[PDB]
Design a protein around this ligand. Structure first.
Ligand SMILES: CCC1=C(C)/C(=C/C2=NC(=C\c3[nH]c(/C=C4\NC(=O)[C@H](C)[C@H]4CC)c(C)c3CCC(=O)O)/C(CCC(=O)O)=C2C)NC1=O
Ligand SMILES: CCC1=C(C)/C(=C/C2=NC(=C\c3[nH]c(/C=C4\NC(=O)[C@H](C)[C@H]4CC)c(C)c3CCC(=O)O)/C(CCC(=O)O)=C2C)NC1=O
Ligand SMILES: CCC1=C(C)/C(=C/C2=NC(=C\c3[nH]c(/C=C4\NC(=O)[C@H](C)[C@H]4CC)c(C)c3CCC(=O)O)/C(CCC(=O)O)=C2C)NC1=O
Ligand SMILES: CCC1=C(C)/C(=C/C2=NC(=C\c3[nH]c(/C=C4\NC(=O)[C@H](C)[C@H]4CC)c(C)c3CCC(=O)O)/C(CCC(=O)O)=C2C)NC1=O
Ligand SMILES: CCC1=C(C)/C(=C/C2=NC(=C\c3[nH]c(/C=C4\NC(=O)[C@H](C)[C@H]4CC)c(C)c3CCC(=O)O)/C(CCC(=O)O)=C2C)NC1=O
Ligand SMILES: CCC1=C(C)/C(=C/C2=NC(=C\c3[nH]c(/C=C4\NC(=O)[C@H](C)[C@H]4CC)c(C)c3CCC(=O)O)/C(CCC(=O)O)=C2C)NC1=O
Ligand SMILES: CCC1=C(C)/C(=C/C2=NC(=C\c3[nH]c(/C=C4\NC(=O)[C@H](C)[C@H]4CC)c(C)c3CCC(=O)O)/C(CCC(=O)O)=C2C)NC1=O
Lengths: 98, 161, 50, 160, 30, 65, 161, 161, 160, 161, 161, 160, 160
C-alpha cells in the first residue's frame, strides 16, 4: 500500500482523481502493469484501469501511443486522467469502475 | 526484467544453494565489463537521433518503401518509423547495460511480430534497418562495445524474424 | 508416386519468415536496395598509372 | 539490483540513464569486490551463524520452543532453523546485488500473511534475524559489518 | 541447533546419498 | 509544486446520460505539471474557477521544482 | 460561450419576445462583417508563430525579463511564455470570429489573474506583450480588421490588469 | 467465389425473400454486360504474354530493381516476377468475367501481403507494375472494357497496398 | 542533485532510502572534492573556453555568422557567446551537483521551442557545445575530462 | 524540494552569477557534514519503530489522550497516531539528509495545521510527541547528529504550532 | 545455407562486381583453414557419443534436473536430451566445416526458443550443457580448432538465450 | 559449392560426411589455387572476351542485329553485351566455387521464361556463350581450358 | 630529414658532426616512435580527413565549386580532393622524417608556378590545408596535434 495517498484522500485535501493519477504513476503500478508489458499492451491495461473501458478506435490507440511515446507512463496517466471522458464519467469523487 | 546479477541470484535461489565459485566468476565478469557498458551507454545516449537518421539514410531512404505504396510513405508513417527505430536503439542500450536480454523479450519482442503482421509492416525492411543501426553504432563505440551492442541487436532481429 | 519418401515441399510465409529472415540466414538485398561500393575517385586518380 | 532499479527508473521516465545514475552504477561496479568478500564471509560460516543465532534466539524467546509455541519439537525446531537459513541466504543475495530487491522480491512481500497462516509470531522471527545480525556483524571488520548490517536492518525493518 | 544441516546438503529423492548406507553396508567380493 | 485550487464544474451531460451525482465545487491540490490540462479541462466543461493559489511552490525558483 | 447570433437570440429569449427589427439589424451587421472576419482569421492562422515571435522581439527581448532574475529567464519559462502568447492570439482569433468576447472571460480571463499572481508572472510585461501582438497583427490584416482584433486584445489586457 | 448472379441469389436467400424487382434489374444489368465481358476476356486471353512484357517494359525495366541489389535481379526472380504478373492478369480476367471481386480476395489477396512482406518483395513497385498492366490492357480492349478491367486491377492494388 | 533524486525516488515508493542509495550518496559526498576541482577548472578559464569555442564554431559553421544567419553582426555574435556562456555555467552547476537536474531543469526543457521561436538552428548550438567540450576536455586530466565530458555529452544529447 | 547544493545553485542562478568563493565554502561545509548525515540516517533507519514507540511511551501513554474522550483513544486513532509520528521521523530524516528543510514545508507542513484543526487533533500534544521523538533520537545518534536532527524537528514543531 | 565461399560469392553478386582482392584474400583464408577444419571434423565424428556423455556427466548429471520433478527426469526425457545434445554437436560440426553459421540459424535456431518455451525445457541448463560440450571438444581437438568450434557453440548458446 | 553440396547431401541422409566426400572436399581445397588462377585469367581479360565473342556472334547470327531482331540498335547491342558480361561473371563464380550451383542458382533457373518474356531467341544466346567459350579456351593452357570449358559447357547445356 | 640536414650542414663546413647535432639526431631517434604513431593516426583515417576537409572547404570557399571556378564539376572536384590527398601524404612523410625537406623537396618548390599555370587560387588551397589541419588536430591528443600542426603550419606558410 502507498500510505500518504491514503492519508491525503481520507482527509479530503487531495481529490480522488488526483489519487488515481498519483497511484497509477506510483511504482507499484509500474512494477505490476507497466514493466511486464509492451506499451501497446500497457496502454490497453491503463485504459481498463483508469477509464474502465477498452480503446474503441484505431485513432485512439494512435493518439495515446503517441502520448506514451513522448512521455512514458507519467504522460500516459496524465493524458488519461485529464480527458473529458474521465471527468464526465467519474468526476472528482467517484472511483473509476468497469 | 533482470540483469546478469539478478539472473545469477535467481539461478542460485532456484537451486536453493549459496553463491558458489562459478556464480562469483560470472559476477566478476560482469563487474569487469560494467565500466565499458557505462561508457558505451553514455556514447549511445549522446547520438540517438544521429544513429537513427544514419540507419534510415543507409537502408530505408531512396528505396520503394519511402515511395508511394510503401509502408514508410506518409509523414505519419515516417514519424512512426523513426519512433520504432528509437525504441529499438533505446532498448538495445538497456539490454547492453543490464547484460541480459530479458527486457527485450519482455518489453519489445512480446507482441511485436503480431503487431507488425496486423499493421502490414515489412519485417525484413525493419530487420535491415536494425542491422544498419547496429553497424552505425558499432562504428561509433568501437569493436568490443559494438559487439556487445550487436548481440542484443541480433536478438531483436532474431525475435522479429 | 510409390518410389519416393515425402519431403517438405511448401512452407507457410510464417515458417519461411522464421527461417530465412533471421540475421545469419539473411542476404543483404532482401527488402531494401544496396548501393554500389566503389572506391573513392580521388584515390583512383592519385595512383601511378591509368 | 542497482542496475535493474536504475534502468526501470529511467524507463518509466522515457529517458536514458542520467549521468548521476551512471556513476552510481560505476561505483557499485567498483565496490562489487568488497561485496563478494562479504558474501564469502557470510557463505562460508553459515553453520555457526545459524547455530549460534538459534541458540541466542531460544535463550531470548523461550516460549516458542516451550510446548504451546510454534517451534516446539524436533522437526519444528529444524524447520525454524531452516527458515533462518532461508533468510541468511536472502541476506547473501542482497549483499551481492547491492540492493534489497532480491530480499524483498523473494522473501518479504507476503511474509506477514504466510506467518499468520502458519501461526507464527513475527516478532520472534525479527529477534531471530536480530541474533543472526549480531553473530554476523561479530564476524567481520567494521565497514563490512556496517554494509551487511544494512541488509540485516532492512529484513528486521520489513518484519515490523 | 546441532542437527540442522543446510537445505542444499540434505539429500533428495533423486540423490543416491539415501542408498549410500546400503552401498557401504553390503559386501562386495574381490 | 502544487496549486490549491477551488472550482465549480457543472456537468451539462447528466440529463442525457442519466448518471448519478458527483458533488461539484471541489477544493483540491493539483500538481504543477498537469495543472495546465486540468485548468483547460475545467474550462472545457464550462465550469467557473473560484480560487487559484500556489501551495507548495515558493515561486521564482529555477531548480528544485 | 456565445457569438453575436447566440447573444441576440438569448436576449430575445430572456425577453420571451420574437426577433424584432433591432435584432434583425444586429444580425445583418454581423452577417455583413462575417466575410471580413473569415479572411482576417485565415490571415492570422497563416502567421501565428511569426506574430508571436515579432511580439517578443518588440517587447520582451533584450530587456531584464530575459536576463537572469527575470520571470522569462529559463528555457522552460521561455517556452511557457511563447505558449501563453500563442493562447492569447488564438483566443483573440476565436473572439474575433464569434464577434463576442464571452469566450475570453469564460476560458482565458477566468482564473488567469490569480494564476499569474500565484506564479509570480509580471502582468504589466505580459500586457505590453499582448499590446505588441495587437500592433503586429493590426499591421498584418489592415485597419478595420486590426481594430476588430484590437478590441478583443484590449479586452484581454483589461481583464488581465 | 461467387459471380454477380450468385451474390444476388445469396442476398435474396439470406433475406429469405424471393427475387424482387431490384434483383431482376441487377441480373438484367449483368446479362447486358456479359457479351462485352466475354469479348474482352477473349481479347485478353489473346495477348497475355504481350501485356505482361509491355507492363515490365513500361515500369520495371531499366530501373534499379532489375539492377544488382534489386528484388527483380536474378533470372529466378525475373521468372517469378513474370509469373506473379501473369497471375494478376489472369485473376483480373476471372473477376471481370464473374463481375464480382470475391475471387480476388479469396485467392489472390488472401495471404499476399504477408508473403510479399516475408520475402522482401517491394509492394509499391509491383503496384506500379499492375497499374501499367491495367493501362496496357485498357489500351487493348477499349474504354469501357478497360474500365471494368481497371476496377478489379484497382481492387488488387488496393488489397496489396 | 543526487540527494534530491534519491530522496524523491524513495519518496514516491513510500519507503526510506535503501542502503544502496545511501552508499551512492556517500560516494558522491566523497567525490565532491574532485567535483569542486573540476568546477574551479571550468570556472577559472571560462574566457578562453568561450573565446576558442566560438572561434572554432564560426570556423566550423560559417553560415550562421554570414549575412542571413542568426548570429550575424556585433550584438548578435555577442548574444551567441552569451548563450554559450550560459551553457558553460550550467555545465559547472551540473558538475557540482553530481547530476543533470540543474542543467535539464534550467536550460534544456523548452530549448527546442525557444530556439525555434528565435529562428536558431539547434544543430549549430550542438556544435557550439561540442567545441566547448573539445576546449574543456583539452584543459584537464583524463578522469576529469571524462567526468566533465559526461555533462557536456548530456547537453549535446539533449539538443538532438 | 531542494538540498543545500540545489539551493546554493538556485541562489547563484537567480543572481545569474557563477559559483564564487562563498558558494564553494557552503558546498565544502555540506560535503564535510555529509558522511555524518549518512551514518545518522542509517542509524535512524535502524530504529524507526523503537523511536516512535519510545516517544509515545514518554509523552502520550497513560495520559488523558489515550483514555476515553481523548483523540488518541480508539485503535484506529492509535494506529493513525503511530502513522503520523512515523511520518514526522521519516521526513525529519529526509530533511537531515538534504540539509535543507524545504521538503518539510513542501510535503509535511503544507496543509497540516488545517487538517489537524479540522479533525480535532491536539497540536500541543503532538508537538510534545515530536519533541520526545527528538529527545530519543538525539540520545540515539549522539550530540551533533542529534542537534542537526533537532533543528528539523524544531522546524516541524514550529510550523505545526 | 551457405559456406564462406557462397557468402563471398553472394556479396560480390549482390554488388554485381567481380571478385576483387578482398574476396580473394577471404577465400585464401578459408582455403588455408580448411585442412584444419577437415581434421577437426574427423576427430569430432570419432567421439560423438563420448563428447555428449561427458557433457552430461559434467553439467546435468547428479543435479536436480535428473531428479524427480526435473525436465530431464524420465527415460523418454533423458533420451530426448541426448538427442538434442547430439543435434547441437552435429550442427556445430557442420558450421565449423562451412565456416559460416548460416546453417545454425537456418536449421537449429529457427523455432528452437519457442519449442523449448512451449515444452517447458530449461534454456539455462541446456546452455550450460552446450558450454560443457564446447569445453570437452576444445579439450579434444586442441586450442585453435577448439576456438573455431566454440565460436559456433557460442552462436548456438546466444541464439538459444 | 562443393562443401555446400556435400553438407546438404549428408544432411538429408541424417548422417555425417562420409570419408569419400571428405577427400572430395580435400581435393577441391587443394585445387583451389588452380581455380583462382583460372579465375584471374577470366577476370583480367574480360574486355577482349566480351568484345571478340560479340563480334563472332553477330558474324555468326546476323539476324538478331538486323532490324527485326532483339539486339538491334545501340542500346540493345549494349544490353546484349551486358548479358554476355553477366554470363562470363557467373562463369567466374562457378570456376571459383568448384560447382555450378552459383551459375544455376543465379542465372539459369528461369532463363527460358525470362528470355521468352523479353522476346529473345535462346539459341542465339547459346551461340553467344559458345563464342565466349571459344575465346576463353583460346586464352589458356590445356587443362585450364578444359576446367573452364566444363562450366561453359554447363551454361550452353542449360540453355538447350 | 634530420640526419640529412645535419650531415649536409657539417659537410659544407668541412667538419664532423658536432656533439650538439649528435644529440639532436639521438633525440629524433628516440622520438621516432611517437612520430610513427602520429603517422599511423594520419594514415588510417585519411578518408574522413579528406572528406570532411573538402566539405568544410567548399562550405568556406564556395566560388571555386560554383561555375566559373577551377574545381567545378565531377572530375574537377575529384582532382581537387586528389590534390588534398597528395598534401596529406606529404604531411605524413614530413611527420615521419622529422623535418620538412620531404614536403618542400616534393610538393612546395614550384607550387605557385604550377597552380598559376593551372589557373588555381592558391589561397583556397591554403584554406584546404587549413581545414585538413582542423580535422587532423581534432583527431589526436594535445602534443600529437601540436607536432602534426607544425607540418600543417609549414604547408600553409609555404603557400603564402
Ligand atoms: C506526510 C505529511 C502528512 C501528515 C503528518 C498527515 C497527517 C494526517 N493525520 C491524520 C489523522 C490523525 N492523526 C492523529 C494523530 C494525533 N492525534 C493525537 O491525539 C496525537 C496528539 C497525534 C499523534 C502524535 C490521529 C489520532 C488521527 C486520526 C483522526 C481520526 O481518525 O479521527 C489524517 C486524517 C486522515 C487519515 O488518518 O488517514 C491526515 C491526513 N498527512 C500527511 O500527508
Ligand atoms: C517498445 C516496444 C514497441 C515497439 C517496437 C512498438 C511498435 C509499433 N509500431 C507501430 C507502427 C509503425 N511502425 C512502423 C515502422 C516501420 N514500417 C516500415 O515500413 C519500416 C520498415 C519500419 C520502421 C523501420 C510504421 C510505418 C508504423 C505505422 C503504421 C501505420 O500508421 O499504419 C505501432 C502501431 C501503433 C502506433 O504507431 O503508434 C506499434 C504499437 N510498440 C512497442 O510498444
Ligand atoms: C488558455 C487560457 C490560459 C492561459 C493564458 C494560461 C496560462 C498559464 N501560464 C502559465 C505559466 C507561465 N506563463 C509565463 C508567461 C509570462 N511570464 C513572463 O515573464 C512574460 C511577461 C509572460 C509571457 C508573455 C511564464 C514564464 C510561465 C511559467 C512560470 C513557471 O514555470 O514558473 C501557467 C503555469 C502552468 C504551466 O506552465 O504550464 C498557466 C496555467 N493557462 C490557461 O489555461
Ligand atoms: C541558461 C539557459 C538559457 C538559454 C540557452 C537562453 C537563450 C536566449 N538566447 C537568446 C538569443 C540568441 N542566442 C543566439 C545564439 C546562437 N545563435 C547562433 O547562431 C549560435 C548557433 C548560437 C550560440 C552559439 C542568437 C543569435 C540570439 C539572438 C536571436 C535574435 O536576436 O533574434 C535570448 C533572447 C535575448 C535574451 O534575453 O538573451 C534568450 C533568452 N536563455 C536562457 O536562460
Ligand atoms: C536440429 C535442430 C532441432 C533441435 C535442437 C530440436 C529439439 C527438440 N527437443 C525436443 C524435446 C526435448 N529436449 C529436451 C532437452 C533438454 N531438456 C532438459 O532438461 C535439458 C536441459 C535439455 C537437454 C540438454 C527434453 C528433455 C525433451 C523432451 C520434452 C518432453 O518429452 O516433454 C523436441 C520435442 C519433440 C521431440 O522430442 O522429439 C524438439 C522438437 N528439434 C530440432 O529440429
Ligand atoms: C545474371 C543473370 C541475368 C541475365 C542473363 C539477365 C538478363 C536481362 N536481359 C535483359 C535484356 C536483354 N538481353 C538481350 C540479349 C541478347 N539478345 C540477343 O539478341 C543476344 C542473343 C543476347 C545477348 C548476346 C537484349 C537484346 C535485351 C533487351 C530486350 C529488350 O529491350 O526488350 C534484361 C532487361 C533489362 C535489364 O534490366 O537489364 C534482363 C534482366 N539478368 C540477369 O540478372
Ligand atoms: C604532391 C605534390 C603535387 C601537387 C599539389 C600536384 C597537383 C596537380 N594538380 C592538378 C590539377 C588540379 N588541382 C585542383 C585543385 C584545387 N582547385 C581548387 O579549386 C581547390 C582550391 C584545389 C584543391 C582543394 C584542380 C581543380 C585541378 C584541375 C585543374 C584543371 O583541370 O585545369 C594537376 C594536373 C592534372 C594531374 O596530372 O593531376 C597536378 C599535376 N601534383 C603533385 O605532384
Amino acid at each position: 500500500s502507498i500510505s500518504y495517498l491514503e492519508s491525503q484522500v481520507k482527509s479530503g485535501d487531495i481529490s480522488m482523481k488526483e489519487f488515481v493519477r498519483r497511484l497509477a504513476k506510483s511504482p507499484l503500478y509500474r512494477k505490476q502493469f507497466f514493466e511486464p508489458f509492451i506499451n501497446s499492451r500497457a496502454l490497453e491495461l491503463a485504459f481498463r484501469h483508469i477509464l474502465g473501458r477498452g480503446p474503441s478506435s484505431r485513432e485512439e490507440v494512435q493518439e495515446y501511443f503517441a502520448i506514451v511515446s513522448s512521455g512514458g507512463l507519467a504522460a500516459l496517466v496524465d493524458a488519461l486522467v485529464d480527458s473529458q471522458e474521465y471527468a464526465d464519467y467519474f468526476g472528482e469523487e467517484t472511483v473509476p469502475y468497469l | 526484467m533482470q540483469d546478469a546479477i539478478t539472473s545469477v541470484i535467481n539461478s542460485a535461489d532456484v537451486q536453493g544453494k549459496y553463491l558458489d565459485g562459478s556464480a562469483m566468476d560470472k559476477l566478476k565478469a560482469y563487474f569487469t565489463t560494467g565500466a565499458l557498458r557505462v561508457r558505451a551507454a553514455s556514447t549511445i545516449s549522446a547520438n540517438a537521433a544521429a544513429i537513427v537518421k544514419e540507419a534510415v539514410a543507409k537502408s530505408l531512404l531512396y528505396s520503394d518503401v519511402t515511395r508511394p505504396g510503401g509502408n514508410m510513405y506518409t509523414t505519419r508513417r515516417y514519424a512512426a518509423c523513426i519512433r520504432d527505430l528509437d525504441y529499438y536503439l533505446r532498448y538495445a542500450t538497456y539490454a547492453m547495460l543490464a547484460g541480459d536480454p530479458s527486457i527485450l523479450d519482455e518489453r519489445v519482442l512480446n507482441g511485436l511480430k503480431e503487431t507488425y503482421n496486423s499493421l502490414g509492416v515489412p519485417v525484413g525492411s525493419t530487420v535491415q534497418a536494425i542491422q544498419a543501426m547496429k553497424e552505425v553504432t558499432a562504428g561509433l563505440v568501437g569493436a568490443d562495445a559494438g559487439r556487445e551492442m550487436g548481440v542484443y541487436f541480433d536478438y531483436i532481429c532474431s525475435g522479429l524474424s | 508416386g510409390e518410389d519416393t519418401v515425402p519431403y517438405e515441399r511448401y512452407l507457410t510465409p510464417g515458417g519461411y519468415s522464421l527461417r530465412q529472415t533471421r540475421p545469419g540466414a539473411l542476404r543483404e538485398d532482401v527488402g531494401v536496395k544496396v548501393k554500389v561500393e566503389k572506391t573513392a575517385r580521388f584515390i583512383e586518380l592519385g595512383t601511378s598509372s591509368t | 539490483s542497482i542496475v535493474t532499479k536504475s534502468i526501470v527508473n529511467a524507463d518509466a521516465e522515457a529517458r536514458y540513464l542520467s549521468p548521476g545514475e551512471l556513476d552510481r552504477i560505476k561505483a557499485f561496479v567498483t565496490s562489487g569486490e568488497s561485496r563478494l568478500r562479504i558474501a564469502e564471509t557470510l557463505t562460508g560460516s553459515r553453520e555457526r551463524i545459524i547455530k549460534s543465532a538459534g541458540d541466542a534466539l531460544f535463550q531470548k524467546r523461550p516460549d516458542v520452543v516451550s510446548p504451546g509455541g510454534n517451534a516446539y519439537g524436533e522437526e519444528m525446531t529444524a524447520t525454524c532453523l531452516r527458515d533462518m537459513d532461508y533468510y541468511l541466504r536472502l541476506i547473501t543475495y542482497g549483499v551481492v546485488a547491492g540492493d534489497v530487491t532480491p530480499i524483498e522480491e523473494i522473501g518479504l512481500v507476503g511474509v506477514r500473511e504466510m506467518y499468520k497462516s502458519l501461526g507464527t509470531p513475527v516478532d520472534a522471527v525479527a529477534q531471530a534475524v536480530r541474533e543472526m545480525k549480531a553473530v554476523a556483524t561479530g564476524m567481520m571488520s567494521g565497514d563490512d559489518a556496517a554494509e551487511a548490517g544494512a541488509y540485516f536492518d532492512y529484513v528486521i525493518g520489513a518484519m515490523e | 541447533v546441532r542437527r540442522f544441516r543446510t537445505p542444499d546438503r540434505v539429500p533428495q529423492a533423486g540423490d543416491p546419498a539415501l542408498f549410500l548406507n546400503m552401498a557401504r553396508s553390503a559386501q562386495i567380493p574381490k | 509544486r502544487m496549486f490549491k485550487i477551488t472550482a465549480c464544474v457543472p456537468s451539462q451531460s447528466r440529463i442525457r446520460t442519466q448518471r448519478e451525482l458527483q458533488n461539484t465545487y471541489f477544493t483540491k491540490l493539483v500538481p504543477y505539471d498537469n495543472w495546465f490540462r486540468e485548468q483547460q479541462r475545467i474550462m472545457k466543461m464550462g465550469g467557473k474557477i473560484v480560487k487559484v493559489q500556489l501551495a507548495t511552490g515558493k515561486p521564482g525558483t529555477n531548480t528544485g521544482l
